[PDB]
């Protein structure tokens, strides 16, 4: 008679129907990604529309069960996602035009290209074409031609499409009783219903701003170290107290600095750790790469992989006849069907990637016992963070000497480890200010604090303050930098990258304290230790059925994000960078410009 | 390797909802629509009216744990009727003298 009995009955039947259609929808996308055919492209759209319209029909009956009469926490969380009508709250005209803008901006990004200024006949697409050239290009003009001319025909062209993208998504949040569309992405961390663990949506703005303050002293020493190496090339354009150019960051948008690791090597007279030449002599194929990584999950106490997982894996691309996307991705269909689509070559990166791709599958096995609505990560940052901590333990010299890749006589000292910590810092440290910059910019534009004319005025002004990057060529309001980005144009969460760094280092410090490892943190290895796997397995099976603030306390004992594991893991590198930067100026100024002298 | 086929097998169903729990050794084939709340149903699907029978998705691609298992349950009951069924016997060799 109570609403709780009627709501639970709706959820018991919905979990079966939603799980059946989601499997066929994910299977149609699997056959389309592994094989390009005219039959699979129609099956993905057919099975995709059946599952998309299924949530729209069930959302009508979901809003008829108010959550005020439900005293159960697990029931309100399953109805929290079904209560939202999605795009049904928008008008019929704005709902149909919304999918058009998303498909148009995604098509222009895929079909966008920059013709060679020297060779007008040859025109190379961005991915892979322009993304590959910008990595190894040391030229000043060659990098500027591809970086500047892209946003001319893209950033300026996507501006009227980006203006409509802001207006349409703001009307959806207003009908959902949200302050703005920037608050919509902050609703993933929202926690209510438990005394003392409640987490407000507006708290994230103060959290990412406060944690970034303690990141500054670590980032200023690394930014000055990279600037000191590139100062001898162009002393006029690169000022010691100034900022680095935007096109020299190693790629188009400057997301990762790993491309600069070649020239930033502190000691070139010592060898580097590489398993590429070791796997060639051992004669290993794609079959035994995943097999050796599966034993890593057994040593920590986690279950092994099912027979259907290794049998259905796609280990290569059979030429151009049947084409598959080589971008590594872990696809979770349902009902115990686990598959991964990746092109596996023999490289040092594919070894660490195998632990990352299998980390998502191993993460899905713990909470697989939960209902379909309760199968998910506790947030958007826990998805990729679980796979990274598996790869961090594999990149350590201790794990490589265990299976026989690295020679046991390899000398491990400060000179070898500082070189390894710098490579990870370019990917880790360099990502945090860039992720905090662009995400905070989207929150300010979606809120309305920045007029349409000041979009680019505030973009580069706040860029020299955060990441310390200045534009070689000044841009007007016509250009849009985020419009060309993959995540912004495809409407994907950009905040998951910032919080991932803080969540993965907390778990790295907690698991090494449970296994009683001594010494620096980068020397820790979780292999052969079953004590740390048991404490982690408790949280992995919870998913989002429990508050992420409560599940985080069961591992690291912290109720929020903390920078302490970020400083301790980079502490050996922070002490070395401080001594080398004494002859230079630590920090940068925002009043310096390459075209203003 | 037998029941599951490509595309799914909807022939095998199950009763998801019932007003109460079944008694031991009871079989209920009734297709009557289950009524969750006080809203009248009258055989028409709608709000608080659900069709109890649901389908088992069967394909070879599903994981091993959820693969369908054919279960044969033998019910052993000793009544006051004369016993007939017994275990298999064993015949030995015959010797004389």
From Swiss-Prot, chain A:
Protein location: Cell membrane; Cytoplasm; Cell projection, Cilium; Apical cell membrane
Impact upon substituting residue 16 to A: Increases slightly the interaction with RBD domain of SARS-CoV-2 spike protein
A GO cellular component entry from the record: plasma membrane
The organism's place on the tree of life at top rank: Eukaryota
Record's keyword terms, sorted: Carboxypeptidase, Cell membrane, Cell projection, Chloride, Cytoplasm, Disulfide bond, Glycoprotein, Host cell receptor for virus entry, Host-virus interaction, Hydrolase, Isopeptide bond, Membrane, Metal-binding, Metalloprotease, Phosphoprotein, Protease, Receptor, Secreted, Signal, Transmembrane, Transmembrane helix, Ubl conjugation, Zinc
Mutagenesis / variant outcome for changing residue 23 to R: Increases slightly the interaction with RBD domain of SARS-CoV-2 spike protein
Effect after changing residue 365 to A: Slightly inhibits interaction with SARS-CoV spike glycoprotein
Outcome of mutating residue 341 to K/A: No effect on interaction with SARS-CoV spike glycoprotein
Variant or mutagenesis effect after changing residue 368 to L: Increases slightly the interaction with RBD domain of SARS-CoV-2 spike protein. In sACE2.v2.2; increases interaction with RBD domain of SARS-CoV-2 spike protein
Protein name: Angiotensin-converting enzyme 2
Organism: Homo sapiens
Gene behind this protein: ACE2
Curated annotation (Swiss-Prot), chain B:
Protein name: Spike protein S1
Phenotype for residue 47 to V: In strain: Omicron/BA.4, Omicron/BA.5, Omicron/BQ.1.1
Region spans: Receptor-binding motif: 1-69
Superkingdom of source: Viruses
Role, per record: Attaches the virion to the cell membrane by interacting with host receptor, initiating the infection. The major receptor is host ACE2. When S2/S2' has been cleaved, binding to the receptor triggers direct fusion at the cell membrane. When S2/S2' has not been cleaved, binding to the receptor results in internalization of the virus by endocytosis using host TFRC and GRM2 and leading to fusion of the virion membrane with the host endosomal membrane. Alternatively, may use NRP1/NRP2 and integrin as entry receptors.
Effect of residue 1 to K: In strain: Omicron/BA.1, Omicron/BA.2, Omicron/BA.2.12.1, Omicron/BA.2.75, Omicron/BA.4, Omicron/BA.5, Omicron/BQ.1.1, Omicron/XBB.1.5, Omicron/EG.5.1
Region (Disordered): 16-51, 80-97
Subunit relationships: Binds to host ACE2. RBD also interacts with the N-linked glycan on 'Asn-90' of ACE2. Cleavage of S generates a polybasic C-terminal sequence on S1 that binds to host Neuropilin-1 (NRP1) and Neuropilin-2 (NRP2) receptors. Interacts with host integrin alpha-5/beta-1 (ITGA5:ITGB1) and with ACE2 in complex with integrin alpha-5/beta-1 (ITGA5:ITGB1). May interact via cytoplasmic c-terminus with M protein. May interact (via N-terminus) with host bilirubin and biliverdin, thereby preventing antibody binding to the SARS-CoV-2 spike NTD via an allosteric mechanism.
Part of the full-length chain shown: 440 to 536 of 1273
Source species of the chain: Severe acute respiratory syndrome coronavirus 2 (2019-nCoV)
Cystine crosslinks: 41-49
Chain segments carrying region Immunodominant HLA epitope recognized by the CD8+: 9-17
């Amino acid at each position: 008679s109570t609403i709780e009995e009627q709501a639970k009955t709706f959820l018991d039947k919905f979990n079966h129907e939603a799980e059946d259609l989601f499997y066929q929808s994910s299977l149609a996308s699997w056959n389309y990604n592994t094989n390009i055919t005219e039959e699979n492209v129609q099956n993905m759209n057919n099975a995709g529309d059946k599952w998309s319209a299924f949530l729209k029909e069930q959302s009508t009956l979901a809003q008829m069960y108010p959550l005020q009469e439900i005293q159960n926490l697990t029931v309100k969380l399953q109805l929290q996602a079904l209560q939202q009508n999605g795009s049904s709250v928008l008008s019929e005209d704005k709902s149909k035009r919304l999918n058009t803008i998303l498909n148009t901006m995604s098509t222009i990004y895929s079909t966008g290209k920059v013709c060679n200024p020297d060779n007008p006949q040859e025109c190379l697409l961005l991915e892979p074409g322009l993304n590959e050239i910008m990595a190894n290009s040391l030229d000043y003009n060659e990098r500027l031609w591809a970086w500047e001319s892209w946003r001319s025909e893209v950033g300026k062209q996507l501006r009227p499409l980006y203006e409509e993208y802001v207006v349409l998504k703001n009307e959806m949040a207003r009908a959902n009783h949200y302050e703005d569309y920037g608050d919509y992405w902050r609703g993933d961390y929202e926690v209510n219903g438990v005394d003392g663990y409640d987490y407000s949506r507006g708290q994230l703005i103060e959290d990412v701003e406060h944690t970034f303050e303690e990141i500054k002293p670590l980032y200023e020493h690394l930014h000055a170290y990279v600037r000191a190496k590139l100062m001898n090339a162009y002393p006029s354009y690169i000022s010691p107290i100034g900022c680095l150019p935007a096109h020299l960051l190693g790629d188009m948008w400057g997301r990762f600095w790993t491309n600069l690791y070649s020239l930033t090597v502190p000691f070139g007279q010592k060898p580097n750790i590489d398993v590429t030449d070791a796997m060639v002599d051992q004669a290993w194929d794609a079959q035994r790469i995943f097999k050796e990584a599966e034993k890593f999950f057994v040593s920590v106490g986690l279950p092994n992989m099912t027979q259907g997982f290794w049998e259905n894996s796609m280990l290569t691309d059979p030429g151009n006849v049947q084409k598959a996307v080589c971008h590594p991705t872990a696809w979770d269909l349902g009902k115990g069907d686990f598959r991964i689509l990746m092109c596996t070559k023999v490289t040092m990166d594919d070894f660490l990637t195998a632990h990352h791709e299998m980390g998502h599958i191993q993460y899905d096995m713990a909470y697989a016992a939960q209902p379909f609505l309760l199968r998910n990560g506790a947030n958007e940052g826990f998805h990729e963070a679980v796979g990274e901590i598996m790869s961090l333990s594999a990149a350590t010299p201790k794990h490589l000497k265990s299976i026989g890749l690295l020679s046991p006589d390899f000398q491990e000292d400060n000179e070898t480890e500082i070189n390894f910590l710098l490579k990870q810092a370019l990917t880790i440290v360099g990502t945090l200010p860039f992720t905090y910059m662009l995400e905070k910019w989207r929150w300010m534009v979606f809120k309305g604090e920045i007029p349409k004319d000041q979009w680019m005025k505030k973009w580069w002004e706040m860029k020299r303050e955060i990441v310390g990057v200045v534009e070689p060529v000044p841009h007007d309001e016509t250009y849009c930098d985020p419009a060309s980005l993959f995540h912004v144009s495809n409407d994907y969460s950009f905040i998951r990258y910032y919080t991932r760094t803080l969540y993965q280092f907390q778990f790295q410090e907690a698991l090494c304290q449970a296994a009683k490892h001594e010494g620096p943190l980068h020397k820790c290895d979780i292999s052969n230790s079953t004590e740390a796997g048991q404490k982690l397995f408790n949280m992995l099976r919870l998913g989002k059925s429990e508050p992420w603030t409560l599940a985080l306390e069961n591992v690291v004992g912290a109720k929020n994000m903390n920078v302490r594991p970020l400083l301790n893991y980079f502490e050996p590198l922070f002490t070395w960078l401080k001594d080398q930067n004494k002859n230079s100026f630590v920090g940068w100024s925002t009043d310096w410009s390459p075209y203003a002298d | 390797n037998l029941d599951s086929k490509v595309g799914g097998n909807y022939n095998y169903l199950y009763r998801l909802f019932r007003k109460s729990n079944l008694k031991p050794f009871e079989r209920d084939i009734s297709t009557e629509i289950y009524q969750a709340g006080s809203t009248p149903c009258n055989g028409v699907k709608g709000f608080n009216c659900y069709f109890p029978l649901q389908s088992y998705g069967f394909q070879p691609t599903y994981g091993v744990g959820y693969q369908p298992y054919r279960v044969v349950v033998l019910s052993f009951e000793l009544l006051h009727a004369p016993a007939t069924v017994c275990g298999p016997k064993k015949s030995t060799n015959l010797v004389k003298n």
